[model samples]
Structures are given as structure tokens and as C-alpha cells.
Target: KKKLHFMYVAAAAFVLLFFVGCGVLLSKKK
Candidate 1:
């Protein structure tokens, strides 16, 4: 369904953002 596609996109974006944030923190120097 169209709604399902949007839901999947939202979930994927959320996961992408989460990993990106974690990567930034890991790569940050003290």
C-alpha cells in the first residue's frame, strides 16, 4: 500500500539518522 511505503521510508530514515549520529560520535576526537 502507499501508506506502507511511507512507513517503511520513515523507519529507514530513522535508522539511517541513528547510525549517522553514532558514527559522528565515534569519529569525534576528545
Candidate 2:
């Protein structure tokens, strides 16, 4: 159960990073 929780958090973090990165690129473009 603990391992599963860790995996979930890692996945969420990766997604958050990708989202933020995209936003940064858009801001730079404009």
C-alpha cells in the first residue's frame, strides 16, 4: 500500500511538471 501511494505521487508530480512546462513555453512565445 505504501509503495502504491509513492507511485501515485510520482506520477502526479510528473504530470504537474509537464503542465507547468507547457505553460512556460506558451508564455515565452507571446
Candidate 3:
């Protein structure tokens, strides 16, 4: 790990979007 590990953050953020979208879809289920 070095240089603030930018790749790590990028990948995590990309995957985070999918998870957040899924959570929002479930919340809207009615």
C-alpha cells in the first residue's frame, strides 16, 4: 500500500454504487 492507494478507493467506490443502488431499490419496493 502506497500513494494513498487510489486504486483501492476507486474499486471500492465503484462497487459501493451498486450496493447503494440495490439498497435504494429495496427501499422503494411497495
Candidate 4:
């Protein structure tokens, strides 16, 4: 259970970071 929860959190954070990175790049372009 703990491992599953950690995996989910890690995936969520990775996805969030991916979007955040894209947004940062777009803003820099602007």
C-alpha cells in the first residue's frame, strides 16, 4: 500500500512538473 501510494504521488508530481516546464518555456518565449 505504501509503495502504491508513493508511486501515484510520484507520477502526479512528474506530470505536474511536465506541464509546469512547458508553461515556463512558453512564458519565456513570450
Candidate 5:
């Protein structure tokens, strides 16, 4: 259960980082 929870958290973090990176790229274009 702990391992699964950690994996979920890591996935969420990856997605959050992905969105943040996209935002930065778009803002830089503007």
C-alpha cells in the first residue's frame, strides 16, 4: 500500500510538472 501510494504521488507530481512546463513555454512565446 505504501509503494502504491508513492507511485500515485509521483505520477501526480509528474503531471503537475508537465503542466507547469507547458505554461512556461506558452508564456515565453507571448
Candidate 6:
């Protein structure tokens, strides 16, 4: 259970970072 929870958190963080990276790139283009 602990490992599964950690995996979920890691996945969420990865996706969040992905969107944040895209946002940064878009803002830089503007």
C-alpha cells in the first residue's frame, strides 16, 4: 500500500511538471 501510494504521488507530480513546462515554454514564446 505504501509503495502504491508513492507511485500515485509521483505520477501526479510528473504530470503537473509536464504541464508547467509547457506553460513556461508558451509564455517564453509570447
The Cα RMSD of model 3 versus the native structure comes to 3.1
Alpha carbon deviation, residue 13, candidate 5 (Å):
0.5
Candidate 6 clashes between residue pairs 3 or more apart in a chain or in different chains: none
Residue 11, model 3: Cα distance from true site in angstroms: 1.0
Candidate numbers sorted by lDDT from highest down: 2, 1, 5, 6, 4, 3
Model 5 TM-score (2 dp): 0.35
**TM-score of candidate 2 versus the correct structure, residues matched by position:** 0.36
| Alpha-carbon local distance difference test for all models | 0.83, 0.84, 0.81, 0.82, 0.83, 0.82
lDDT of 5 at 29: 94
lDDT of 6 by residue, 1-30 (tens): 987799889988878977787887888894
What's model 1's lDDT at 23? Answer: 83
Q: Write the per-residue lDDT of candidate 3 for residues 1-30, one digit (tens) a residue.
A: 754498787888788987887887898999
lDDT for 4 in candidate 6 is 73
TM-score for each predicted model, relative to the true structure: 0.35, 0.36, 0.37, 0.36, 0.35, 0.36
Measured on C-alpha atoms, candidate 2 has an lDDT of: 0.84
Q: Highest lDDT: which candidate?
A: 2
lDDT score for residue 22 of model 6? 83
- The runs of at least 3 residues in candidate 3 whose Cα sits more than 4 Å from the true structure, single-residue gaps closed, are 22-30
Model 2 regions more than 4 Å off: 1-3, 21-30
Write out the backbone clash pairs for model 4.
none
In angstroms, how far off is 11's CA in candidate 6? 0.7
* Candidate 6 error regions (>4 Å): 1-4, 18-30
Predicted structure 6: lDDT: 0.82
Residues 1-30 of candidate 5 have per-residue lDDT tens digits of 987799888888878977787887888894
